[PDB]
Amino acid sequence: MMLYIVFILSVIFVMGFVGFSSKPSPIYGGLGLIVSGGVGCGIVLNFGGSFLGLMVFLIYLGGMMVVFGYTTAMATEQYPEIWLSNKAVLGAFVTGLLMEFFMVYYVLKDKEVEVVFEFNGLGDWVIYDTGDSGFFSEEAMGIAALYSYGTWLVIVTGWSLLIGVVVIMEITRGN
Amino acid sequence: MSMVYMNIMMAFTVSLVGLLMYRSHLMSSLLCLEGMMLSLFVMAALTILNSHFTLASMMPIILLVFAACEAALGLSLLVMVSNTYGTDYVQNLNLLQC
Amino acid sequence: MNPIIFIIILLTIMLGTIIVMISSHWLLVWIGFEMNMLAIIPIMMKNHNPRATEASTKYFLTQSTASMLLMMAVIINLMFSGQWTVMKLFNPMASMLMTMALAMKLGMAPFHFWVPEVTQGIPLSSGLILLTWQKLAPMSVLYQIFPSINLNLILTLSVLSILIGGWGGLNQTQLRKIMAYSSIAHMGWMTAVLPYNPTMTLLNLIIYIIMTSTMFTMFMANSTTTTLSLSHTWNKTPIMTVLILATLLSMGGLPPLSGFMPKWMIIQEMTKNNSIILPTFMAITALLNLYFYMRLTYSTTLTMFPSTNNMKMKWQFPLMKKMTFLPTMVVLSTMMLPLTPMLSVLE
Amino acid sequence: MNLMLALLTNFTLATLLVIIAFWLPQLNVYSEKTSPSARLPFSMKFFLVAITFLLFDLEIALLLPLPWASQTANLNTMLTMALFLIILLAVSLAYEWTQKGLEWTE
Amino acid sequence: SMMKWNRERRRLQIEDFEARIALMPLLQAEKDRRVLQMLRENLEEEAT
Amino acid sequence: MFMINILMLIIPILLAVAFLTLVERKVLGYMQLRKGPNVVGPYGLLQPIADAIKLFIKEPTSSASMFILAPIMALGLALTMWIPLPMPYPLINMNLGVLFMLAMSSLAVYSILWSGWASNSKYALIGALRAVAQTISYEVTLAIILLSVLLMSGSFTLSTLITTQEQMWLILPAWPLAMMWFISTLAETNRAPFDLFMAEYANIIMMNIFTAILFLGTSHNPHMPELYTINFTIKSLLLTMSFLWIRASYPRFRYDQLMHLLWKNFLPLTLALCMWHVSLPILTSGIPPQT
Amino acid sequence: PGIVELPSLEDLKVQEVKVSSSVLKAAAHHYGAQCDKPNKEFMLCRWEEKDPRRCLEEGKLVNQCALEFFRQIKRHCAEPFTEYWTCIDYSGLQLFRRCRKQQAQFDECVLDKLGWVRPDLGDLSKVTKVKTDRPLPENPYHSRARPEPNPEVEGDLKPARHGSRLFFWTM
Amino acid sequence: AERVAAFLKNVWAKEPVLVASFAIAGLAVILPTLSPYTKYSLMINRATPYNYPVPLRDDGNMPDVPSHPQDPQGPSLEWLKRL
Ligand SMILES: CCCCCCCCCCCCCCCCCC(=O)OC[C@H](COP(=O)(O)OCCN)OC(=O)CCCCCCCCCCCCCCCCC
Ligand SMILES: CCCCCCCCCCCCCCCCCC(=O)OC[C@H](COP(=O)(O)OCCN)OC(=O)CCCCCCCCCCCCCCCCC
């Protein structure tokens, strides 16, 4: 069963997406995005992306989603709603989970489903690589190449972040 | 394609529909805009990591920085909308119908 | 804004567009769009009112949706080709997503609903950037991916845009609403000819920008934003009404003005490929645009609407607005038809 | 497996210690105790501080690969781009500082 | 002091890497024989 | 066998935190010319037991779920921070151990947000938003300082900090960073003069354990691992005692002043020292090995 | 498509080097200076041929030189070597710097009983050259023929005949 | 000059924290260019062998490529040991 941990993790990924996509109060909305973000990091970890997965926790969850919850607490109702207590929120949740469960059924039963693309359900491990014994992490070498190879990426990315600060101070000044 | 792609593509679609089907809180839609980015981060990282395309390893990081920079701008607009009306309801943004 | 910051923000708007135009990598195309959107939100809010904030929010939501679909199409393309080169896409689903992302960014119908509302909600100077400079970056991408674009999709959007733009303008008395619908209708011509000859898509883009800039520049000179406020122009600057008439007749595609040139060259390129019905339908439908342009000339230049007593006090003061390049722009907008063969410089 | 077992234990033990802490008190059966728009309001300063954190945090993610970046043969380019990122991190702060973004007087 | 120690650590890493380089041929040869043997084994059960 | 190891880590942590409360009250007392607990058990050694029992039998919201999640998140994540600590051998040996701790520490700010949110009081919420702003502000210097230190170490591995300091503690080459790090941990743990309970005190010990490793590295002899643990424990205890020492001797900051303490003193100086420590290994030819 | 060719199990057989990783690590420096010739021929084969099948004989000589190497030690220097790799095996990282005394004893042993010299720092990382008789793989990637290029437009650029020839324009 | 030593003396009195930061950042930017040991950093990074050193087929005219790892030819790390 652990042989399909990446598929099991990706099923919870979708359920968490159905969570905040059905759009309960923006406070359970942010809780579903946190669970999916953490589950989403788990998938990246199992593919060899240790640094990319940890960048999700450090930046996405501990940075972006913190500011979302912070902003949500300052300007949004303050009182949540019992999850699924609203008809539309509950109707979309069941609809999503039904399609999530039906896709899971036909792919595992038939080891294949066809929705826009062709999907094969033999497992995710079957495409893994069978050759590496280098004494370094390839992820780390690729990311570390940013400062040598990606001079142009750094410049535009740096400028955008500086301009983000300038832009956000203008937007909120009010005169 | 592999099986995990089925669900990462399912999650992008779910958050796309969630984004285009509004309710009332403008905050609830910005989270759908960030669920879309999260799915695209995971989809890209799996492709790049599995294919061993080393220099592309920094693409997910750049995509994460820019999208978060976007969300910072989106939250700022939400806060300015909240000032004018006391709530982030999207039905209060209908002045420009005429 | 502090004038120095305003200049830097404008150069970031330009930098984002240029990054898209010079990039051979799909991530840098996405980054240029992201940077471009980031810097244009400031100039839309710069007068601070509920309408300017509504326009900026509606713009942000629309453009942000388009960029996530663009990134999704870029990743699908990577999965199926293992490369990032800005060129034809290697998956039909990637092409549908990119074409719809660019259509949303252009405001093409049926992704058009934001254009009239966002344009009405911001200043004239900001609207000029929205309807002119903002078309370059999406257009230059459509220019390079066109060999893989779905013909029924690109032609479906173009026809829809020529109809929606023409009909939507008939019911408008707001000059910013009129210009927005004019922009939608003109986008429809540029993408109709793209599958056949991308050069004639650049020709129509250049000439549309030149004439659209001339209009906004002339609206800004007298600070006129409604039909009735523009109808006072004859009693302050009579020269401006003549230039407004000429430019509006040019935008209508009437010979021998410069605006006839793009429509002329597109019909030629479409018939060479045995497209007879579509250019005939398109050209007839453009008569809607000429109608609500002609309405504007009636209340501005060809009749004299009633004036006000306080208009007498304006006669004593001169225009102090910069009106940069207006004399050159108006002469390119009206008197360029004899030099039509010069379009080869765009080849 | 080890990490998953450790996380499961840590958050299972926390869960147990939380529920029983919610239920052990009801052993006493204490007597019933009769105790019968959308802005806080919020100040724009507490919003800017969070956003400035986010934007600086993003620029930190760009610096995290620095320990690995020093291992390259193109050290002149690496050093120039590293000092570029930190300096613009300082430039952003100097803009915040000089435009009173870092104040608390209303 | 940090400079002296870090230089000494780089030298140890070079020696550590060089021991690997000396052994890579022997590990590469056995990896080849394990891959082909596994493929040959799979082909037999495929035939049946 | 692994399950014993995780139990042999959690239970001592809870016992250590329980008796840290005793040490706090006696250490503060003697600095204040009094004694502190010396009646409940000899030298007060049973005071933590008495407090615990009393607390759990005492008589005991806007969101029921969030009122349950908040204690679990803080308590679960406080214990998780200990799994990669080389003492000298980590329970979980991670190549990105330092990066893991920054990530988990960041999530700690959620319990503050959720607990304030679940309170139901507008007043309670803004108090939480002030606490969240203090934390994330001072997470900036922790991350940048830690990055500056790791440029002399060479990786994100926590056991590599042991090897980095084989000849000499990093406090000597990095005392200006250690100063701002130590204050940032107090602000991060919302300790005096930045105080504007189990999970809270577990972080306090863990942050001081992490400080000893980062700046006061203990020599490790593989044949006698227990000596490292003793020396390691002593260094962390004294660092924890210095938290008590600092609390007794200072008044409290104002909220705007501690924001100013970071945004206008630590961050400008922390940025410059980051630049300095990127350049220094390159110009001295003392770049550490990547492995 | 064709049938993937696979050598039979009989051809894949060879006497293994059944010593643990710390045993290899301890002999690695001497091993890389004694068995360099057969080692480098196998690696030149692998990089040149890009095919594990085309280098199965060369890989058997790698084992033969490795087995012989470990017998040289077992015949003269067993105890100093056993004492040395037992020190390496203790460390979790299998560090060299923790066993410099036992490494020393092993070095004088081989330098007296066998005449071996430990390569200096940087030696095993040199790019060397190998004399081989195996023919160079001419088309290792098994490429097809490349498609023919389009004709090269050549000649003098004369002005366009009668100008643009666009509708009625005479220039 | 002396109009400047009075400026510097004023900031040293009113903003010591910033004077230190701007002093350290200037040293960080400048010293790497003026240091004689910055070249050894490039060499040491270039001397670390991550990959296998693939041999060269010995056509017959490669005089400076060694035939054996212990041969005199080829680059040497002698500077590294003394350094
Ligand atoms: C070049 C090759 C292609 C050929 C196509 C033809 C191109 C021509 C158009 C190009 C653009 C040029 C525009 C010409 C502007 C003419 C302005 C003018 O002549 O004066 C306008 C007049 C002056 O008003 P005032 O300010 O009082 O000055 C009095 C002096 N003390 O203002 C007034 O007194 C008010 C006038 C009342 C309104 C009259 C409306 C009719 C105007 C007809 C001219 C415009 C025609 C444009 C269409 C092209 C025609 C073919
Ligand atoms: C010099 C290089 C060679 C080194 C050799 C040694 C020579 C050292 C000479 C250094 C001289 C530097 C002098 C700089 C002084 C700082 C300017 C200044 O006076 O700022 C004062 C002002 C005070 O602010 P405030 O207290 O809020 O208001 C007054 C209330 N009484 O504050 C302000 O005006 C706002 C300014 C804030 C921005 C300054 C900090 C920069 C941002 C942090 C990054 C620090 C690293 C520097 C990065 C720059 C690129 C290197």
Three-state secondary-structure class, residue G129: strand
Q: Which atom of ligand 2 is nearest to the CA of D102?
A: 27
| List of chain F residues whose C-beta atoms are within 8 Å of the C-beta of residue H40 | 285
**Would the CA dihedral through F226, F232, F238, F244 be positive or negative?**
negative
Whose CA is closest to A49, among B44, F97, F81, B35?
A: B44
Which amino acid is it at C10? Answer: L
> Is the CB–ligand 1 distance for residue C238 below 6 Å?
yes
- How many other C-beta atoms lie within 10 A of the C-beta of residue H47? 20
Dihedral, C270, C272, C277, C281 alpha carbons, nearest 10: 40
Tell me which DSSP letter residue C90 carries. S
* Experimentally determined by: cryo-EM
Nearest Cα to Cα of residue H55 among G55, G119, G122, G43 = G43
Rounded CA separation B80/B93 (Å): 12
C315-338 residues labelled b (16+ CB within 10 A) or e (exposed): eeeeeeeeeeebeebbebbbebee
Say if residue C116 is preceded by a cis peptide, omega within 30 of 0: no
Q: Are F230 and F87 in contact (CB under 8 A)?
A: no
- The string of DSSP letters for D63-105 reads HTTHHHHTTSS-HHHHHHHHHHHHHHHHHHHHHHHHTTTT---
Cα–Cα distance for residue pair C118/C59, rounded to 1 Å: 6
User: Backbone dihedral region of F191: left (phi > 0), alpha (psi from -120 to 50 degrees) or beta?
Assistant: beta
Q: Which atom of ligand 1 is nearest to the CA of C301?
A: 38
For C247, phi then psi, to 5°, come to -65, -45
Q: CA G39 from chain center: how many Å?
A: 7
Task: Kindly report the three-state secondary structure assignment for every residue of A28-54.
Answer: HHHHHHHHHHHHHHHHHHHCCCHHHHH
Task: Classify residue B90: in a domain, yes or no.
Answer: no
Closest by CA to F190, choosing from F91, F82, F111, is F111
Residues 6 or more apart whose Cβ sits within 8 Å of residue H55:
G40, G43, G44, G127, G128, G129, G130
CA atoms of F112 and F118, how far apart (whole Å): 10
Domain annotation covers residue B79: yes
| G69 touches E: beta carbon within 8 Å | no
Separation of alpha carbons B12 and F173, rounded Å: 49
Backbone angles phi and psi of B85, in degrees to 5: -130, -10
One-letter amino acid for residue F244 of the chain: L
Q: Are C326 and C245 in contact (CB under 8 A)?
A: no
Please provide residue A115's backbone torsions phi and psi, each rounded to the nearest 5 degrees. Answer: -135, 105
The domain of D19 spans: 7-98
Find, among F197, F40, F54, the residue nearest to D28 by Cα: F54
Across-strand partners of A119? A113
Judge if the beta carbon of residue C334 lies within 6 A of ligand 1: yes
Q: Which residues pair with A112 in a beta bridge?
A: A120
How far apart, in whole angstroms, are the C-alpha atoms of residue B53 and residue C82?
9
Separation between Cα atoms, residue B13 and residue B33, nearest integer Å? 12
Nearest partner of G129 among H61, E17, E14, judged by Cα: H61
- CB-based contact C190:C209 (threshold 8 Å): no
Give the N- to C-terminal CA distance of chain C in Å, as an integer. 41
Phi, psi of B5 (to 5 degrees): -60, -30
Q: Residue A156: closest CA among chain D residues belongs to which residue?
A: D85
F268 lines ligand 2 (CB under 6 A): yes
Domain assignment present for B11: yes
Residue whose structure tokens are 């129509």: C204
> Ligand 1 centre and the CA of C335: distance in Å?
13
Residue of E nearest to H48 (CA): E14
In the structure encoding, which two tokens stand for residue F75, read together?
């308590």
Q: How far lies E14's CA from each of E21, F234, F291, H48, H80, in Å?
A: 10, 36, 10, 6, 11
Q: At what angle do helices D75-98 and F267-284 cross, to 10 degrees?
A: 170
Give the residue on E whose Cα is nearest the Cα of A136. E17
Domain count, chain B: 1
Torsion of CA F224, F226, F231, F235, to 10 degrees: 140
Q: Which two tokens stand for residue C121?
A: 């909600």
Instruction: Give, in degrees to the nearest 5, the angle at Cα A25 between A19 and A26.
Output: 80
- In degrees, rounded to 5, the angle at the alpha carbon of residue A94 between the alpha carbons of residues A83 and B24 is 50
> Which chains reach chain G with 3 or more Cβ–Cβ distances below 8 angstroms?
C, E, F, H
Q: C-alpha angle A115/A120/A125, rounded to 5°?
A: 140
DSSP G23-87: HHHHHHHHHHHHSHHHHHHHHHHHHHH--GGGGHHHHHHHHHHHHHHHHHHHHH-HHHHHHHHHH
In a domain, D46, yes or no: yes
User: What are G14's two structure tokens?
Assistant: 């060879």
C239, C245, C296, C328, best to mutate for ligand 1 pocket (most atoms within 8 Å of CB): C239
* Residue D14 to residue F143, Cβ atoms within 8 A: no
* Cα–Cα distance list, C328 to C211, C234, C325, C333, C334 (Å): 11, 22, 5, 9, 10
Which helix or strand (DSSP H or E) is residue H56 part of? strand H56-57
Q: How many domains, chain D?
A: 1
Q: Which residues contact D56 (CB under 8 A, 6 or more apart)?
A: D89, D92, F140
Close Cβ partners of D90 (under 8 Å, ≥ 6 residues apart): F268, F271, F272, H25
Helix, strand, coil content of chain B in percent (nearest 5) = 85, 0, 15
F39 contacts chain D (CB < 8 A):
no
Rounded to whole angstroms, the Cα distance separating C197 from C346 reads: 11
Q: Are D46 and F133 in contact (CB under 8 A)?
A: yes
Per-residue 3-state assignment (H helix, E strand, C coil) for chain A: CHHHHHHHHHHHHHHHHHHHHCCCCHHHHHHHHHHHHHHHHHHHHHCCCHHHHHHHHHHHHHHHHHHHHHHHHHECCCCCCCCCCCHHHHHHHHHHHHHHHHHHHHHHHHCEEEECEEEECCCCHHHCCCCCCCCCCHHHHHHHHHHHCCHHHHHHHHHHHHHHHHHHHHHCCCC
A103 neighbors B6 (Cβ within 8 angstroms) = yes
d(CA F263, CA B88): 30
Query: What distance in Å separates the CA atoms of residue E33 and residue G6, rounded to the nearest whole number?
Result: 11
Torsions phi, psi of C75, nearest 5? -75, -40
Residues B92 and F290: their CA atoms lie apart, in Å, by 56
CATH number assigned to the domain comprising residue B36: 1.10.287.3510
Q: To 10 degrees, the CA torsion angle through C330, C334, C337, C339?
A: -20
Element at G130 (helix H, strand E): strand G129-130
**Cα distance from N-terminal residue to C-terminal residue, chain D:** 53
Q: What's C226's DSSP letter?
A: B
**CA torsion sign, G98 to G101 to G106 to G111?**
positive
Give the span between the Cα atoms of G60 and G12, in whole angstroms.
9
| Other CB atoms within 10 A of residue C278 CB | 15
Report, in angstroms and rounded to the nearest whole number, the Rg of chain G calculated over CA atoms: 29
Dist. CA C210 → ligand 1 center (Å): 19
Structure tokens at C73: 């199409």
Assigned domain for D104 exists:
no
Residue of chain F with shortest Cα separation from H27? F276
Nearest CA to ligand 2 atom 13: H19
In the block, residue with structure tokens 């000439």: C207
Residue D105 lies in a domain: no
| Span from the CA of H24 to the centroid of ligand 2 (angstroms) | 11
The tokens describing C268, both together, are 């030629």
Mapping DSSP to helix (H, G, I), strand (E, B) and coil, where does residue F146 land? helix
| Spatial distance between the Cα atoms of A61 and C340, rounded to a whole number of angstroms | 57
Q: Report the alpha-carbon distance of residue A8 to residue A81 in Å, rounded.
A: 29
Residue C221: which H helix or E strand, with range? helix C198-222
Tokens of F195: 């105080």
Q: Tokens standing for A60?
A: 């996405």
What are the structural domains of chain A? 4-169 (1.20.120.1200)
**G102 token code pair:** 């036992």
The structure tokens listed for F218 are 């203990």
Specify whether the CB–CB gap between C265 and C207 falls below 8 A. no
State both tokens at F271.
């940025």
CA dist G63 → E26, E27, G68, H39 (Å):
7, 10, 8, 42
Judging contact as 3 or more Cβ pairs under 8 Å, the answer for C and F is no
Distance, in Å, from the CA atom of D48 to the CA atom of C88, rounded to the nearest integer, reads 43
Question: How far is Cα G2 from Cα F271, in angstroms, rounded to an integer?
Answer: 62
CATH (domain of D94):
1.20.58.1610
Q: Is C277 touching ligand 1 by the criterion CB < 6 Å?
A: no
Closest residue by CA, ligand 1 atom 35: C238
Instruction: Tell me how far apart the alpha carbons of residues D14 and F269 are, in angstroms, rounded to a whole number.
Output: 39
Contact C54, B46 (CB under 8 A): no
Q: How far apart are CA A100 and CA B11, in angstroms?
A: 10
Q: Is B93 domain-assigned?
A: no
User: Alpha-carbon distance F157 to F170, whole Å?
Assistant: 16
Q: Do F262 and D56 contact (CB within 8 A), yes or no?
A: no
Closest CA to B45 of B29, B28, B64: B64
Q: Of F125, C344, C174, which is closest to residue A75 (Cα–Cα)?
A: F125
- Contact by Cβ (8 Å): C197, C230: no
CB C270 within 8 A of CB C346: no
Q: Choose among B42, A130, A121: nearest CA to C79.
A: B42
Task: Please check whether residue D69 touches A, CB under 8 A.
Answer: yes
Burial F200-210 (b: 16+ CB within 10 A, else e): bbbbbbbbbbb
Q: Work out the number of other CB atoms within 10 angstroms of the CB of residue C90.
A: 16
Give the DSSP letter string of F254-279.
PHHHHHHHIIIIIHHHHHHHHHHHHH
Could you tell me the sign of the dihedral formed by the alpha carbons of G9, G10, G12, G18, in that order? Answer: positive
Could C42 and A159 be called an inter-chain contact, meaning their C-beta atoms sit closer than 8 Å? no
Domain span holding position B44: 3-85
Q: Which residues of E touch F159 (CB under 8 A)?
A: none
CB neighbourhood size of C341 (10 A):
14
- Provide the 8-state DSSP code for H57: E
Whether residue A36 contacts residue A13, with contact meaning beta carbons closer than 8 Å, is answered with yes
Tell me the C-alpha distance between H12 and A12, whole Å: 58
The half-sphere exposure of F235 on its side-chain side, counting CA atoms within 13 A, is 20
With respect to residue D72, please indicate whether it lies within any of the assigned structural domains: yes
- DSSP 8-state symbol, C283: H
C335 lines ligand 1 (CB under 6 A): yes
Q: Are A57 and A41 in contact (CB under 8 A)?
A: yes
| Pairing mode of beta strands G129-130, A117-120 | unpaired
Q: Is residue F271 a contact partner of residue D86, using CB atoms and an 8 Å limit?
A: yes
Which residue type, as a one-letter code, is found at position D96?
A: E
- Say if D65 falls within a structural domain: yes
Cβ(F248)–Cβ(F31) under 8 Å?
yes
DSSP assignment of F75-133 equals HHHHHHTTTT--SSS-SS--TTHHHHHHHHHHHHHHHHHHHHHHH--HHHHHHHHHHHH
CA separation for the pair F166, F170 (Å, rounded)? 10
**Backbone angles phi and psi of F41, in degrees to 5:** 75, 155
Measure the N-to-C terminal CA separation of chain E; round to a whole number of Å.
Answer: 68
The answer to whether the bond into G80 is cis (omega within 30° of 0) is: no
SS (H, E, C) D46-74: HHHHHHHHHHHHHHHHHHCCHHHHCCCCC
H10 CB within 6 A, ligand 2: no
Selected residue of C33, C72, C74, C97 to mutate for chain B interface (largest B Cβ count, 10 A): C72
The Cα angle at residue A52 between residues C22 and D74, in degrees rounded to 5: 55
The ligand 1 atom at the shortest distance from the C-alpha of residue C331 is 11
Could you tell me which of A55, A74, A73 has the C-alpha nearest to residue A63? A55
User: Which residues touch A2 (CB under 8 Å, ≥6 apart)?
Assistant: D1
* Helix-strand-coil split of chain C, %, nearest 5: 75, 0, 25
Is residue C181 classed as helix, strand or coil in its secondary structure? helix
F274: Cβ–Cβ under 8 A, 6 or more apart, which residues? Answer: D63, D86, F144, F147, F148
Enumerate neighbours of H (3 or more CB pairs within 8 A): A, D, E, F, G
Within 8 A by CB and 6+ apart from F43, the residues are none
CA-nearest residue, atom 22 of ligand 1: C239
- Considering only CA atoms, which residue is closest to atom 41 of ligand 1? C242
Query: Is residue C245 lining ligand 1, measured as CB closer than 6 Å?
Result: yes
Among H45, F220, D93, F232, smallest CA distance to A166 is for D93
Please indicate whether residue H31, judged by its CB atom, sits closer than 6 Å to ligand 2.
no
């969570």: which residue's tokens? A19
Tokens at residue C275, please? 């497209």
